[PDB]
Amino acid sequence: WVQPITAQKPSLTLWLDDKMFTGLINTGADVTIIKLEDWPPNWPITDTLTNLRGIGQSNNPKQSSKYLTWRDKENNSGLIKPFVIPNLPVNLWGRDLLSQMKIMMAS
């Protein structure tokens, strides 16, 4: 059912939406970003982000908002609306989901 997380690496098995699956855990997440390759093909997704070149005031490419629900076999882990772009945003969860999952210095 569930897989034991070995060392802080992008590898772990928890359930999402309503079924178990694999994923990757980041030890330094700021904003939950999930690539488009994991988004509902039923409808397209687009957002407004920022791409500041300092001198080249630019804007980042729209990233879906479709929120994902990741929960460990214990029936809990974290779920929030991430950013999904068809360019592979490094697939990272949010500091909230990570902190809980196994990032917060629980001591």
PDB file of N, CA and C in Angstrom:
ATOM      1  N   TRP A   1       0.840  -1.227   0.000  1.00  0.00           N
ATOM      2  CA  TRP A   1       0.000   0.000   0.000  1.00  0.00           C
ATOM      3  C   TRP A   1       0.863   1.259   0.000  1.00  0.00           C
ATOM      4  N   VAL A   2       1.668   1.418   1.044  1.00  0.00           N
ATOM      5  CA  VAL A   2       2.542   2.579   1.170  1.00  0.00           C
ATOM      6  C   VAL A   2       4.011   2.173   1.112  1.00  0.00           C
ATOM      7  N   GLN A   3       4.868   3.120   0.749  1.00  0.00           N
ATOM      8  CA  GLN A   3       6.297   2.856   0.660  1.00  0.00           C
ATOM      9  C   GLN A   3       7.074   3.724   1.649  1.00  0.00           C
ATOM     10  N   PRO A   4       8.108   3.158   2.298  1.00  0.00           N
ATOM     11  CA  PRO A   4       8.924   3.891   3.268  1.00  0.00           C
ATOM     12  C   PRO A   4       9.875   4.874   2.594  1.00  0.00           C
ATOM     13  N   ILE A   5       9.802   6.137   3.005  1.00  0.00           N
ATOM     14  CA  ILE A   5      10.658   7.172   2.440  1.00  0.00           C
ATOM     15  C   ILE A   5      12.108   6.982   2.877  1.00  0.00           C
ATOM     16  N   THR A   6      12.990   6.759   1.906  1.00  0.00           N
ATOM     17  CA  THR A   6      14.405   6.559   2.191  1.00  0.00           C
ATOM     18  C   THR A   6      15.210   7.817   1.883  1.00  0.00           C
ATOM     19  N   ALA A   7      15.673   8.489   2.930  1.00  0.00           N
ATOM     20  CA  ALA A   7      16.459   9.708   2.773  1.00  0.00           C
ATOM     21  C   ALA A   7      15.654  10.792   2.064  1.00  0.00           C
ATOM     22  N   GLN A   8      16.004  12.047   2.325  1.00  0.00           N
ATOM     23  CA  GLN A   8      15.311  13.172   1.710  1.00  0.00           C
ATOM     24  C   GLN A   8      15.566  13.207   0.206  1.00  0.00           C
ATOM     25  N   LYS A   9      14.701  12.538  -0.549  1.00  0.00           N
ATOM     26  CA  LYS A   9      14.833  12.490  -1.999  1.00  0.00           C
ATOM     27  C   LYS A   9      13.463  12.514  -2.672  1.00  0.00           C
ATOM     28  N   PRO A  10      13.420  12.845  -3.973  1.00  0.00           N
ATOM     29  CA  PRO A  10      12.165  12.906  -4.734  1.00  0.00           C
ATOM     30  C   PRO A  10      11.581  11.523  -5.008  1.00  0.00           C
ATOM     31  N   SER A  11      11.296  10.776  -3.945  1.00  0.00           N
ATOM     32  CA  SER A  11      10.733   9.437  -4.089  1.00  0.00           C
ATOM     33  C   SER A  11       9.921   9.033  -2.859  1.00  0.00           C
ATOM     34  N   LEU A  12       8.649   8.721  -3.084  1.00  0.00           N
ATOM     35  CA  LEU A  12       7.750   8.307  -2.010  1.00  0.00           C
ATOM     36  C   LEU A  12       6.419   7.852  -2.596  1.00  0.00           C
ATOM     37  N   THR A  13       5.706   6.993  -1.879  1.00  0.00           N
ATOM     38  CA  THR A  13       4.418   6.509  -2.362  1.00  0.00           C
ATOM     39  C   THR A  13       3.286   6.821  -1.385  1.00  0.00           C
ATOM     40  N   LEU A  14       2.374   7.683  -1.824  1.00  0.00           N
ATOM     41  CA  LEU A  14       1.198   8.058  -1.041  1.00  0.00           C
ATOM     42  C   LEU A  14      -0.003   8.100  -1.964  1.00  0.00           C
ATOM     43  N   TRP A  15      -1.191   8.283  -1.407  1.00  0.00           N
ATOM     44  CA  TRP A  15      -2.386   8.332  -2.230  1.00  0.00           C
ATOM     45  C   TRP A  15      -2.769   9.761  -2.579  1.00  0.00           C
ATOM     46  N   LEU A  16      -3.306   9.923  -3.772  1.00  0.00           N
ATOM     47  CA  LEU A  16      -3.714  11.232  -4.254  1.00  0.00           C
ATOM     48  C   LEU A  16      -5.091  11.160  -4.902  1.00  0.00           C
ATOM     49  N   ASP A  17      -5.902  12.189  -4.671  1.00  0.00           N
ATOM     50  CA  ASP A  17      -7.255  12.248  -5.221  1.00  0.00           C
ATOM     51  C   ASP A  17      -8.136  11.171  -4.595  1.00  0.00           C
ATOM     52  N   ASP A  18      -7.822   9.912  -4.884  1.00  0.00           N
ATOM     53  CA  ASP A  18      -8.586   8.792  -4.344  1.00  0.00           C
ATOM     54  C   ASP A  18      -7.928   7.459  -4.697  1.00  0.00           C
ATOM     55  N   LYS A  19      -6.597   7.444  -4.732  1.00  0.00           N
ATOM     56  CA  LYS A  19      -5.858   6.233  -5.054  1.00  0.00           C
ATOM     57  C   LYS A  19      -4.366   6.399  -4.793  1.00  0.00           C
ATOM     58  N   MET A  20      -3.722   5.311  -4.380  1.00  0.00           N
ATOM     59  CA  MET A  20      -2.293   5.330  -4.097  1.00  0.00           C
ATOM     60  C   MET A  20      -1.476   5.551  -5.368  1.00  0.00           C
ATOM     61  N   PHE A  21      -0.317   6.185  -5.208  1.00  0.00           N
ATOM     62  CA  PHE A  21       0.575   6.470  -6.326  1.00  0.00           C
ATOM     63  C   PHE A  21       1.930   6.950  -5.814  1.00  0.00           C
ATOM     64  N   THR A  22       2.880   7.136  -6.727  1.00  0.00           N
ATOM     65  CA  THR A  22       4.216   7.590  -6.352  1.00  0.00           C
ATOM     66  C   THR A  22       4.368   9.095  -6.551  1.00  0.00           C
ATOM     67  N   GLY A  23       5.483   9.633  -6.068  1.00  0.00           N
ATOM     68  CA  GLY A  23       5.750  11.055  -6.194  1.00  0.00           C
ATOM     69  C   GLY A  23       7.147  11.411  -5.722  1.00  0.00           C
ATOM     70  N   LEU A  24       7.408  12.705  -5.540  1.00  0.00           N
ATOM     71  CA  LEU A  24       8.716  13.154  -5.081  1.00  0.00           C
ATOM     72  C   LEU A  24       8.583  14.223  -3.999  1.00  0.00           C
ATOM     73  N   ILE A  25       9.391  14.101  -2.950  1.00  0.00           N
ATOM     74  CA  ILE A  25       9.358  15.057  -1.849  1.00  0.00           C
ATOM     75  C   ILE A  25      10.571  15.976  -1.872  1.00  0.00           C
ATOM     76  N   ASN A  26      10.316  17.276  -1.780  1.00  0.00           N
ATOM     77  CA  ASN A  26      11.383  18.265  -1.770  1.00  0.00           C
ATOM     78  C   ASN A  26      11.627  18.753  -0.349  1.00  0.00           C
ATOM     79  N   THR A  27      12.894  18.897   0.011  1.00  0.00           N
ATOM     80  CA  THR A  27      13.255  19.352   1.346  1.00  0.00           C
ATOM     81  C   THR A  27      13.329  20.878   1.415  1.00  0.00           C
ATOM     82  N   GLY A  28      12.922  21.539   0.334  1.00  0.00           N
ATOM     83  CA  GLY A  28      12.945  22.990   0.294  1.00  0.00           C
ATOM     84  C   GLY A  28      11.935  23.550  -0.684  1.00  0.00           C
ATOM     85  N   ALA A  29      10.659  23.283  -0.429  1.00  0.00           N
ATOM     86  CA  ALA A  29       9.588  23.759  -1.293  1.00  0.00           C
ATOM     87  C   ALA A  29       9.079  25.121  -0.835  1.00  0.00           C
ATOM     88  N   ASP A  30       8.683  25.948  -1.794  1.00  0.00           N
ATOM     89  CA  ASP A  30       8.158  27.274  -1.499  1.00  0.00           C
ATOM     90  C   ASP A  30       6.744  27.404  -2.047  1.00  0.00           C
ATOM     91  N   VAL A  31       6.556  26.909  -3.265  1.00  0.00           N
ATOM     92  CA  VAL A  31       5.257  26.941  -3.921  1.00  0.00           C
ATOM     93  C   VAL A  31       5.010  25.639  -4.672  1.00  0.00           C
ATOM     94  N   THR A  32       3.991  24.905  -4.253  1.00  0.00           N
ATOM     95  CA  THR A  32       3.645  23.636  -4.875  1.00  0.00           C
ATOM     96  C   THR A  32       3.439  23.773  -6.381  1.00  0.00           C
ATOM     97  N   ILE A  33       4.363  23.212  -7.157  1.00  0.00           N
ATOM     98  CA  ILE A  33       4.268  23.257  -8.615  1.00  0.00           C
ATOM     99  C   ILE A  33       4.263  21.850  -9.201  1.00  0.00           C
ATOM    100  N   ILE A  34       3.210  21.525  -9.937  1.00  0.00           N
ATOM    101  CA  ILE A  34       3.093  20.225 -10.579  1.00  0.00           C
ATOM    102  C   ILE A  34       3.011  20.420 -12.083  1.00  0.00           C
ATOM    103  N   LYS A  35       3.868  19.738 -12.815  1.00  0.00           N
ATOM    104  CA  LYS A  35       3.897  19.871 -14.261  1.00  0.00           C
ATOM    105  C   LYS A  35       2.554  19.521 -14.886  1.00  0.00           C
ATOM    106  N   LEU A  36       2.351  19.994 -16.111  1.00  0.00           N
ATOM    107  CA  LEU A  36       1.104  19.762 -16.827  1.00  0.00           C
ATOM    108  C   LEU A  36       0.890  18.285 -17.130  1.00  0.00           C
ATOM    109  N   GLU A  37       1.982  17.550 -17.264  1.00  0.00           N
ATOM    110  CA  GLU A  37       1.912  16.122 -17.560  1.00  0.00           C
ATOM    111  C   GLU A  37       1.068  15.366 -16.531  1.00  0.00           C
ATOM    112  N   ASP A  38       0.735  16.022 -15.420  1.00  0.00           N
ATOM    113  CA  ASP A  38      -0.066  15.392 -14.372  1.00  0.00           C
ATOM    114  C   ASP A  38      -1.379  16.141 -14.151  1.00  0.00           C
ATOM    115  N   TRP A  39      -1.827  16.863 -15.172  1.00  0.00           N
ATOM    116  CA  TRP A  39      -3.060  17.636 -15.081  1.00  0.00           C
ATOM    117  C   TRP A  39      -4.166  17.032 -15.953  1.00  0.00           C
ATOM    118  N   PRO A  40      -5.443  17.269 -15.585  1.00  0.00           N
ATOM    119  CA  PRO A  40      -6.597  16.754 -16.335  1.00  0.00           C
ATOM    120  C   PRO A  40      -6.603  17.209 -17.793  1.00  0.00           C
ATOM    121  N   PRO A  41      -6.412  16.280 -18.745  1.00  0.00           N
ATOM    122  CA  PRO A  41      -6.419  16.614 -20.174  1.00  0.00           C
ATOM    123  C   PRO A  41      -7.794  17.066 -20.659  1.00  0.00           C
ATOM    124  N   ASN A  42      -8.802  16.905 -19.807  1.00  0.00           N
ATOM    125  CA  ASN A  42     -10.165  17.291 -20.145  1.00  0.00           C
ATOM    126  C   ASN A  42     -10.265  18.785 -20.443  1.00  0.00           C
ATOM    127  N   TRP A  43      -9.561  19.598 -19.658  1.00  0.00           N
ATOM    128  CA  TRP A  43      -9.594  21.048 -19.845  1.00  0.00           C
ATOM    129  C   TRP A  43      -8.199  21.663 -19.708  1.00  0.00           C
ATOM    130  N   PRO A  44      -7.865  22.657 -20.558  1.00  0.00           N
ATOM    131  CA  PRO A  44      -6.561  23.335 -20.516  1.00  0.00           C
ATOM    132  C   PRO A  44      -6.404  24.197 -19.265  1.00  0.00           C
ATOM    133  N   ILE A  45      -5.163  24.396 -18.823  1.00  0.00           N
ATOM    134  CA  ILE A  45      -4.910  25.190 -17.623  1.00  0.00           C
ATOM    135  C   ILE A  45      -3.857  26.273 -17.831  1.00  0.00           C
ATOM    136  N   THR A  46      -4.186  27.473 -17.384  1.00  0.00           N
ATOM    137  CA  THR A  46      -3.295  28.623 -17.549  1.00  0.00           C
ATOM    138  C   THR A  46      -3.265  29.615 -16.371  1.00  0.00           C
ATOM    139  N   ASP A  47      -2.076  30.097 -15.962  1.00  0.00           N
ATOM    140  CA  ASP A  47      -2.046  31.145 -14.906  1.00  0.00           C
ATOM    141  C   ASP A  47      -1.098  32.338 -15.219  1.00  0.00           C
ATOM    142  N   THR A  48      -1.020  33.274 -14.285  1.00  0.00           N
ATOM    143  CA  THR A  48      -0.168  34.446 -14.451  1.00  0.00           C
ATOM    144  C   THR A  48       0.932  34.460 -13.396  1.00  0.00           C
ATOM    145  N   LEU A  49       2.176  34.276 -13.833  1.00  0.00           N
ATOM    146  CA  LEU A  49       3.304  34.261 -12.911  1.00  0.00           C
ATOM    147  C   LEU A  49       4.276  35.399 -13.242  1.00  0.00           C
ATOM    148  N   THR A  50       5.322  35.560 -12.433  1.00  0.00           N
ATOM    149  CA  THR A  50       6.291  36.636 -12.644  1.00  0.00           C
ATOM    150  C   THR A  50       7.669  36.114 -13.044  1.00  0.00           C
ATOM    151  N   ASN A  51       8.254  36.756 -14.051  1.00  0.00           N
ATOM    152  CA  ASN A  51       9.582  36.420 -14.537  1.00  0.00           C
ATOM    153  C   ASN A  51      10.392  37.699 -14.642  1.00  0.00           C
ATOM    154  N   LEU A  52      10.927  38.150 -13.522  1.00  0.00           N
ATOM    155  CA  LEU A  52      11.683  39.388 -13.504  1.00  0.00           C
ATOM    156  C   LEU A  52      13.157  39.164 -13.809  1.00  0.00           C
ATOM    157  N   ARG A  53      13.613  39.768 -14.898  1.00  0.00           N
ATOM    158  CA  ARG A  53      15.005  39.676 -15.304  1.00  0.00           C
ATOM    159  C   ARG A  53      15.831  40.784 -14.647  1.00  0.00           C
ATOM    160  N   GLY A  54      15.244  41.459 -13.653  1.00  0.00           N
ATOM    161  CA  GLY A  54      15.933  42.553 -12.982  1.00  0.00           C
ATOM    162  C   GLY A  54      15.970  43.782 -13.848  1.00  0.00           C
ATOM    163  N   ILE A  55      16.543  43.601 -15.016  1.00  0.00           N
ATOM    164  CA  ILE A  55      16.631  44.646 -16.010  1.00  0.00           C
ATOM    165  C   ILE A  55      15.664  44.326 -17.135  1.00  0.00           C
ATOM    166  N   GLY A  56      15.232  43.066 -17.169  1.00  0.00           N
ATOM    167  CA  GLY A  56      14.288  42.631 -18.177  1.00  0.00           C
ATOM    168  C   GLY A  56      12.939  42.263 -17.582  1.00  0.00           C
ATOM    169  N   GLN A  57      12.270  43.250 -16.995  1.00  0.00           N
ATOM    170  CA  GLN A  57      10.966  43.041 -16.371  1.00  0.00           C
ATOM    171  C   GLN A  57      10.052  42.168 -17.230  1.00  0.00           C
ATOM    172  N   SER A  58      10.071  40.862 -16.970  1.00  0.00           N
ATOM    173  CA  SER A  58       9.242  39.918 -17.714  1.00  0.00           C
ATOM    174  C   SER A  58       8.197  39.261 -16.810  1.00  0.00           C
ATOM    175  N   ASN A  59       7.340  38.444 -17.414  1.00  0.00           N
ATOM    176  CA  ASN A  59       6.287  37.741 -16.683  1.00  0.00           C
ATOM    177  C   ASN A  59       6.390  36.232 -16.908  1.00  0.00           C
ATOM    178  N   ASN A  60       6.203  35.448 -15.847  1.00  0.00           N
ATOM    179  CA  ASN A  60       6.281  33.994 -15.961  1.00  0.00           C
ATOM    180  C   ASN A  60       5.020  33.429 -16.625  1.00  0.00           C
ATOM    181  N   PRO A  61       5.162  32.260 -17.278  1.00  0.00           N
ATOM    182  CA  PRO A  61       4.069  31.591 -18.010  1.00  0.00           C
ATOM    183  C   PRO A  61       2.983  30.970 -17.131  1.00  0.00           C
ATOM    184  N   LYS A  62       1.734  31.231 -17.519  1.00  0.00           N
ATOM    185  CA  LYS A  62       0.563  30.762 -16.832  1.00  0.00           C
ATOM    186  C   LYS A  62       0.675  29.319 -16.378  1.00  0.00           C
ATOM    187  N   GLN A  63       0.498  29.094 -15.081  1.00  0.00           N
ATOM    188  CA  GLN A  63       0.533  27.748 -14.514  1.00  0.00           C
ATOM    189  C   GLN A  63      -0.803  27.380 -13.892  1.00  0.00           C
ATOM    190  N   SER A  64      -1.399  26.297 -14.375  1.00  0.00           N
ATOM    191  CA  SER A  64      -2.684  25.822 -13.865  1.00  0.00           C
ATOM    192  C   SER A  64      -2.831  26.069 -12.370  1.00  0.00           C
ATOM    193  N   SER A  65      -4.063  25.994 -11.899  1.00  0.00           N
ATOM    194  CA  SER A  65      -4.352  26.162 -10.483  1.00  0.00           C
ATOM    195  C   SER A  65      -4.918  24.872  -9.878  1.00  0.00           C
ATOM    196  N   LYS A  66      -5.422  23.972 -10.738  1.00  0.00           N
ATOM    197  CA  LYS A  66      -6.002  22.695 -10.292  1.00  0.00           C
ATOM    198  C   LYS A  66      -5.272  22.163  -9.063  1.00  0.00           C
ATOM    199  N   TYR A  67      -5.961  22.153  -7.925  1.00  0.00           N
ATOM    200  CA  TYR A  67      -5.358  21.702  -6.682  1.00  0.00           C
ATOM    201  C   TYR A  67      -5.308  20.187  -6.570  1.00  0.00           C
ATOM    202  N   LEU A  68      -4.198  19.700  -6.031  1.00  0.00           N
ATOM    203  CA  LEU A  68      -3.992  18.275  -5.849  1.00  0.00           C
ATOM    204  C   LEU A  68      -4.093  17.910  -4.377  1.00  0.00           C
ATOM    205  N   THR A  69      -4.508  16.678  -4.113  1.00  0.00           N
ATOM    206  CA  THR A  69      -4.656  16.203  -2.750  1.00  0.00           C
ATOM    207  C   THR A  69      -3.796  14.971  -2.494  1.00  0.00           C
ATOM    208  N   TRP A  70      -2.647  15.196  -1.868  1.00  0.00           N
ATOM    209  CA  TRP A  70      -1.722  14.126  -1.527  1.00  0.00           C
ATOM    210  C   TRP A  70      -1.887  13.774  -0.058  1.00  0.00           C
ATOM    211  N   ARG A  71      -2.098  12.500   0.210  1.00  0.00           N
ATOM    212  CA  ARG A  71      -2.288  12.023   1.565  1.00  0.00           C
ATOM    213  C   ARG A  71      -1.606  10.678   1.748  1.00  0.00           C
ATOM    214  N   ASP A  72      -0.904  10.514   2.859  1.00  0.00           N
ATOM    215  CA  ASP A  72      -0.214   9.266   3.127  1.00  0.00           C
ATOM    216  C   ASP A  72      -1.195   8.224   3.633  1.00  0.00           C
ATOM    217  N   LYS A  73      -0.806   6.960   3.512  1.00  0.00           N
ATOM    218  CA  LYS A  73      -1.635   5.833   3.941  1.00  0.00           C
ATOM    219  C   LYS A  73      -2.364   6.108   5.255  1.00  0.00           C
ATOM    220  N   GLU A  74      -1.793   6.970   6.091  1.00  0.00           N
ATOM    221  CA  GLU A  74      -2.417   7.315   7.364  1.00  0.00           C
ATOM    222  C   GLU A  74      -3.662   8.174   7.139  1.00  0.00           C
ATOM    223  N   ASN A  75      -3.968   8.451   5.871  1.00  0.00           N
ATOM    224  CA  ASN A  75      -5.130   9.255   5.507  1.00  0.00           C
ATOM    225  C   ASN A  75      -4.886  10.738   5.779  1.00  0.00           C
ATOM    226  N   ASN A  76      -3.710  11.235   5.390  1.00  0.00           N
ATOM    227  CA  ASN A  76      -3.383  12.650   5.599  1.00  0.00           C
ATOM    228  C   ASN A  76      -1.943  12.971   5.200  1.00  0.00           C
ATOM    229  N   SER A  77      -1.749  14.138   4.581  1.00  0.00           N
ATOM    230  CA  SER A  77      -0.417  14.580   4.166  1.00  0.00           C
ATOM    231  C   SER A  77      -0.428  16.045   3.739  1.00  0.00           C
ATOM    232  N   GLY A  78      -1.400  16.423   2.910  1.00  0.00           N
ATOM    233  CA  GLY A  78      -1.476  17.795   2.452  1.00  0.00           C
ATOM    234  C   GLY A  78      -2.129  17.912   1.092  1.00  0.00           C
ATOM    235  N   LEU A  79      -2.829  19.014   0.871  1.00  0.00           N
ATOM    236  CA  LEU A  79      -3.509  19.243  -0.396  1.00  0.00           C
ATOM    237  C   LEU A  79      -3.729  20.733  -0.628  1.00  0.00           C
ATOM    238  N   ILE A  80      -3.267  21.227  -1.773  1.00  0.00           N
ATOM    239  CA  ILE A  80      -3.416  22.645  -2.102  1.00  0.00           C
ATOM    240  C   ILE A  80      -3.302  22.894  -3.603  1.00  0.00           C
ATOM    241  N   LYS A  81      -3.752  24.071  -4.030  1.00  0.00           N
ATOM    242  CA  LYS A  81      -3.714  24.458  -5.440  1.00  0.00           C
ATOM    243  C   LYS A  81      -2.303  24.856  -5.886  1.00  0.00           C
ATOM    244  N   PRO A  82      -1.635  24.003  -6.688  1.00  0.00           N
ATOM    245  CA  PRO A  82      -0.295  24.260  -7.187  1.00  0.00           C
ATOM    246  C   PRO A  82      -0.291  24.886  -8.575  1.00  0.00           C
ATOM    247  N   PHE A  83       0.906  25.090  -9.100  1.00  0.00           N
ATOM    248  CA  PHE A  83       1.088  25.670 -10.421  1.00  0.00           C
ATOM    249  C   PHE A  83       1.514  24.600 -11.416  1.00  0.00           C
ATOM    250  N   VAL A  84       0.734  24.450 -12.478  1.00  0.00           N
ATOM    251  CA  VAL A  84       0.999  23.441 -13.484  1.00  0.00           C
ATOM    252  C   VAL A  84       1.275  24.035 -14.865  1.00  0.00           C
ATOM    253  N   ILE A  85       2.508  23.882 -15.339  1.00  0.00           N
ATOM    254  CA  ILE A  85       2.879  24.362 -16.670  1.00  0.00           C
ATOM    255  C   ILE A  85       3.462  23.200 -17.473  1.00  0.00           C
ATOM    256  N   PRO A  86       3.230  23.166 -18.793  1.00  0.00           N
ATOM    257  CA  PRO A  86       3.726  22.082 -19.639  1.00  0.00           C
ATOM    258  C   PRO A  86       5.205  22.219 -19.982  1.00  0.00           C
ATOM    259  N   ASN A  87       6.030  22.430 -18.963  1.00  0.00           N
ATOM    260  CA  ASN A  87       7.466  22.559 -19.162  1.00  0.00           C
ATOM    261  C   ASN A  87       8.248  21.873 -18.040  1.00  0.00           C
ATOM    262  N   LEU A  88       7.538  21.172 -17.157  1.00  0.00           N
ATOM    263  CA  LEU A  88       8.172  20.478 -16.046  1.00  0.00           C
ATOM    264  C   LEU A  88       8.744  21.474 -15.043  1.00  0.00           C
ATOM    265  N   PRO A  89       7.908  21.965 -14.109  1.00  0.00           N
ATOM    266  CA  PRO A  89       8.331  22.925 -13.091  1.00  0.00           C
ATOM    267  C   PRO A  89       9.119  22.267 -11.960  1.00  0.00           C
ATOM    268  N   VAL A  90       9.825  21.179 -12.283  1.00  0.00           N
ATOM    269  CA  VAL A  90      10.628  20.456 -11.305  1.00  0.00           C
ATOM    270  C   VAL A  90       9.763  19.638 -10.346  1.00  0.00           C
ATOM    271  N   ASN A  91       8.447  19.650 -10.567  1.00  0.00           N
ATOM    272  CA  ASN A  91       7.507  18.907  -9.724  1.00  0.00           C
ATOM    273  C   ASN A  91       7.876  18.998  -8.243  1.00  0.00           C
ATOM    274  N   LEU A  92       7.335  20.005  -7.568  1.00  0.00           N
ATOM    275  CA  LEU A  92       7.598  20.201  -6.147  1.00  0.00           C
ATOM    276  C   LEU A  92       6.314  20.510  -5.394  1.00  0.00           C
ATOM    277  N   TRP A  93       6.238  20.023  -4.164  1.00  0.00           N
ATOM    278  CA  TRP A  93       5.082  20.270  -3.322  1.00  0.00           C
ATOM    279  C   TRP A  93       5.268  21.592  -2.592  1.00  0.00           C
ATOM    280  N   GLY A  94       4.331  21.938  -1.723  1.00  0.00           N
ATOM    281  CA  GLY A  94       4.436  23.191  -1.004  1.00  0.00           C
ATOM    282  C   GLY A  94       4.992  23.029   0.397  1.00  0.00           C
ATOM    283  N   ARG A  95       5.673  24.062   0.884  1.00  0.00           N
ATOM    284  CA  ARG A  95       6.273  24.033   2.214  1.00  0.00           C
ATOM    285  C   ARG A  95       5.281  23.554   3.268  1.00  0.00           C
ATOM    286  N   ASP A  96       3.995  23.753   3.009  1.00  0.00           N
ATOM    287  CA  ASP A  96       2.962  23.327   3.941  1.00  0.00           C
ATOM    288  C   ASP A  96       2.830  21.807   3.934  1.00  0.00           C
ATOM    289  N   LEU A  97       2.709  21.232   2.738  1.00  0.00           N
ATOM    290  CA  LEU A  97       2.579  19.786   2.603  1.00  0.00           C
ATOM    291  C   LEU A  97       3.872  19.083   3.007  1.00  0.00           C
ATOM    292  N   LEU A  98       5.009  19.658   2.621  1.00  0.00           N
ATOM    293  CA  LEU A  98       6.302  19.074   2.964  1.00  0.00           C
ATOM    294  C   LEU A  98       6.521  19.113   4.471  1.00  0.00           C
ATOM    295  N   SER A  99       6.430  20.313   5.046  1.00  0.00           N
ATOM    296  CA  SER A  99       6.615  20.497   6.484  1.00  0.00           C
ATOM    297  C   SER A  99       5.895  19.402   7.264  1.00  0.00           C
ATOM    298  N   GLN A 100       4.631  19.182   6.918  1.00  0.00           N
ATOM    299  CA  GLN A 100       3.827  18.162   7.574  1.00  0.00           C
ATOM    300  C   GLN A 100       4.338  16.767   7.236  1.00  0.00           C
ATOM    301  N   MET A 101       4.388  16.454   5.941  1.00  0.00           N
ATOM    302  CA  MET A 101       4.854  15.150   5.478  1.00  0.00           C
ATOM    303  C   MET A 101       6.073  14.673   6.262  1.00  0.00           C
ATOM    304  N   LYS A 102       7.156  15.444   6.205  1.00  0.00           N
ATOM    305  CA  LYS A 102       8.377  15.087   6.917  1.00  0.00           C
ATOM    306  C   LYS A 102       9.481  16.113   6.677  1.00  0.00           C
ATOM    307  N   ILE A 103       9.159  17.393   6.854  1.00  0.00           N
ATOM    308  CA  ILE A 103      10.146  18.451   6.661  1.00  0.00           C
ATOM    309  C   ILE A 103      10.347  19.242   7.949  1.00  0.00           C
ATOM    310  N   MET A 104       9.258  19.491   8.668  1.00  0.00           N
ATOM    311  CA  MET A 104       9.330  20.227   9.924  1.00  0.00           C
ATOM    312  C   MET A 104      10.245  19.509  10.908  1.00  0.00           C
ATOM    313  N   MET A 105      11.134  20.262  11.545  1.00  0.00           N
ATOM    314  CA  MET A 105      12.070  19.690  12.506  1.00  0.00           C
ATOM    315  C   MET A 105      11.335  19.140  13.724  1.00  0.00           C
ATOM    316  N   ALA A 106      10.655  18.012  13.539  1.00  0.00           N
ATOM    317  CA  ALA A 106       9.911  17.381  14.623  1.00  0.00           C
ATOM    318  C   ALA A 106      10.856  16.760  15.645  1.00  0.00           C
ATOM    319  N   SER A 107      11.172  17.517  16.690  1.00  0.00           N
ATOM    320  CA  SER A 107      12.068  17.041  17.739  1.00  0.00           C
ATOM    321  C   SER A 107      11.636  17.570  19.103  1.00  0.00           C
TER     322      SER A 107
END
